[PDB]
Amino acid sequence: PLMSVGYFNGGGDVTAGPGGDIDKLDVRQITHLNYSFGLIYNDEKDETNAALKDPAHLHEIWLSPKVQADLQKLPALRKQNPDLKVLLSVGGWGARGFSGAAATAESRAVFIRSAQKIIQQYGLDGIDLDWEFPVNGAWGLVASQPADRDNFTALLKSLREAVGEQKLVTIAVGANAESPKSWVDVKAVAPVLNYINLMTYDMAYGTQYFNSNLYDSSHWPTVAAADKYSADFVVNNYLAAGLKPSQMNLGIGFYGRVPKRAVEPGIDWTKADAQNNPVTQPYFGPQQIALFASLGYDLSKDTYVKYNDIVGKLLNDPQKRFTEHWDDEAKVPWLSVQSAEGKPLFALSYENPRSVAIKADYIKAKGLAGAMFWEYGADDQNQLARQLAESLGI
């Protein structure tokens, strides 16, 4: 039987924003819910959240008041779907603390003990760790060290022995090709986890246009080898790494991104003096930056647009400033905006019902365990969640 794992960003996130109403959450179309996010008390010098800097609770998990309030309401959710499993996600983009939490037998125990109390207390079915990312540290965003990889294994093994064999232990892993190679030991952690969720999106960076293309497009090609990604490529990288397909969920983003290539010059890092000698050039002028600004998007801060805003604000724009397209090679839709001189410019790729059905198909064909999606808050009246369930056969 196939899985559909849906994230609910109830607590807040640094990319998305303030959390949604759990009293209005419809969960009949999923098998597992990741409630996100638990955070980690930490001593990383650059942490900005004062709650987390408490040295007396270092390495424990921290549940914000909203998260606490929401987890108290799970019994009502389970009346909608009694077979449903509910996990807490700890981590998320920019969440500090894992590197230190995982570092020693002592630090791990404190973390693990903290997770047990949360599970016990709220009646959770399991825990999901989203460390973004070990060794790499999201390019210096969170503390990091070479030992993170083997440390992450130790944490997961210990966490499994503590929670036992009926609770769920799972993780998210990155698209980056380097992740199975040197950030996470996939062969060593698969035997203790129930399944792994692949973050097969957020590719609209460097010289790539598409955020979550299934395959490559000849129509809108990526220029630099290192920026060249697709859901299929990520899925194949982890199979080669030793992860069995029935242990692997394909992640789907219910959002789009404006590609960095529209606003920043693209670098191929394998060239001399790479940084001053770009391979692509931006094509958004101030007027296209103003268009996004006027819809509440500051493109120097973030490029994330949620599906319900894509439908509400962009597709249903009374000035019709965004035009819908479909790429049949990439298998995703994308939007154009008009240049000064009248021509379409590639503005963002995203997912709609058709693209989500196509990935559902691929899940079936490739024999994966299921789908994961980020996230309920970005969907339109559960439209993509429902398509995904229809198409998977849940």
Side-chain angles (χ1 to χ4, degrees):
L2 292 171
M3 278 181 282
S4 180
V5 181
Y7 272 85
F8 175 70
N9 182 60
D13 188 35
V14 186
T15 212
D21 203 355
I22 192 157
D23 281 1
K24 286 162 188 165
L25 188 55
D26 172 356
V27 295
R28 295 165 303 173
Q29 309 99 23
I30 56 162
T31 56
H32 300 68
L33 169 71
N34 295 348
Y35 186 97
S36 44
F37 281 111
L39 289 169
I40 311 190
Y41 282 100
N42 74 77
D43 63 358
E44 298 188 25
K45 195 195 169 64
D46 284 352
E47 178 56 83
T48 57
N49 187 341
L52 303 182
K53 295 181 92 199
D54 190 329
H57 300 294
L58 180 68
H59 311 315
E60 294 175 35
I61 301 163
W62 184 83
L63 302 187
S64 93
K66 167 84 166 49
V67 168
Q68 289 174 60
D70 278 359
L71 296 175
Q72 264 143 244
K73 302 209 189 73
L74 296 178
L77 251 50
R78 292 172 190 287
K79 307 244 187 176
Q80 284 183 40
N81 189 355
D83 304 359
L84 183 66
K85 317 286 190 185
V86 176
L87 310 74
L88 180 70
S89 291
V90 183
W93 178 257
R96 298 178 185 274
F98 278 113
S99 196
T104 61
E106 288 74 5
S107 64
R108 264 130 46 189
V110 159
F111 186 87
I112 291 173
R113 218 181 284 128
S114 183
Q116 283 182 284
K117 289 168 180 208
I118 290 167
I119 292 162
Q120 169 88 336
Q121 171 164 8
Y122 291 110
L124 299 178
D125 293 292
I127 180 153
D128 163 81
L129 276 53
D130 300 354
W131 182 351
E132 315 197 11
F133 302 94
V135 185
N136 169 259
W139 294 273
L141 199 64
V142 309
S144 191
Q145 60 172 324
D148 287 340
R149 177 188 182 257
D150 291 350
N151 287 355
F152 201 19
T153 316
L155 176 48
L156 289 166
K157 284 194 183 168
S158 292
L159 180 54
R160 171 56 76 193
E161 195 69 4
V163 299
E165 230 79 43
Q166 303 278 5
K167 299 285 166 191
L168 297 184
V169 188
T170 74
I171 69 165
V173 301
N176 196 281
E178 186 64 28
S179 175
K181 291 177 170 168
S182 88
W183 304 353
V184 186
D185 190 351
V186 161
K187 267 179 168 153
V189 294
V192 311
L193 299 167
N194 294 86
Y195 56 83
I196 300 177
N197 291 325
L198 305 198
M199 294 171 36
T200 35
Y201 38 64
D202 291 343
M203 296 161 173
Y205 289 87
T207 67
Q208 178 150 310
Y209 286 102
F210 290 104
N211 207 54
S212 62
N213 54 305
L214 191 47
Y215 301 111
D216 296 333
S217 180
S218 78
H219 296 295
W220 296 98
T222 300
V223 187
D227 302 341
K228 200 178 179 159
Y229 281 82
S230 64
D232 188 56
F233 176 57
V234 174
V235 168
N236 284 318
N237 287 340
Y238 283 91
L239 285 181
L243 188 66
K244 300 172 191 167
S246 61
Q247 250 188 319
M248 183 184 303
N249 283 325
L250 179 74
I252 302 172
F254 291 172
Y255 63 96
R257 287 201 180 267
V258 180
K260 290 281 183 173
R261 179 200 177 132
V263 295
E264 261 206 319
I267 298 95
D268 181 323
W269 289 106
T270 72
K271 308 292 193 199
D273 203 359
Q275 205 167 223
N276 308 121
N277 298 334
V279 296
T280 65
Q281 289 291 335
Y283 51 88
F284 273 13
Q287 68 250 63
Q288 286 92 24
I289 284 150
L291 159 66
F292 279 91
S294 76
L295 296 167
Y297 297 105
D298 192 338
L299 290 179
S300 75
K301 280 182 194 215
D302 210 349
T303 59
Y304 177 93
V305 188
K306 31 190 190 192
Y307 178 65
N308 66 55
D309 292 321
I310 297 177
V311 165
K313 279 174 176 168
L314 280 27
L315 289 175
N316 289 305
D317 187 25
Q319 290 171 240
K320 319 178 106 72
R321 290 168 284 188
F322 299 83
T323 305
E324 202 187 335
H325 307 274
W326 175 259
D327 188 300
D328 208 40
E329 281 177 30
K331 305 305 178 186
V332 297
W334 59 280
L335 305 180
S336 64
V337 291
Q338 282 202 254
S339 83
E341 68 285 326
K343 299 150 185 99
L345 302 174
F346 186 105
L348 54 328
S349 74
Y350 59 108
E351 298 275 355
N352 65 13
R354 190 192 179 177
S355 69
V356 164
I358 280 154
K359 289 178 170 67
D361 280 1
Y362 170 97
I363 289 162
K364 265 150 65 236
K366 199 142 211 173
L368 301 187
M372 168 273 287
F373 65 83
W374 175 274
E375 54 103 15
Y376 272 110
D379 198 356
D380 193 346
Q381 300 283 275
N382 284 25
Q383 184 190 24
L384 303 181
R386 285 153 172 285
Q387 189 56 62
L388 180 52
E390 280 166 36
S391 297
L392 286 174
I394 286 145

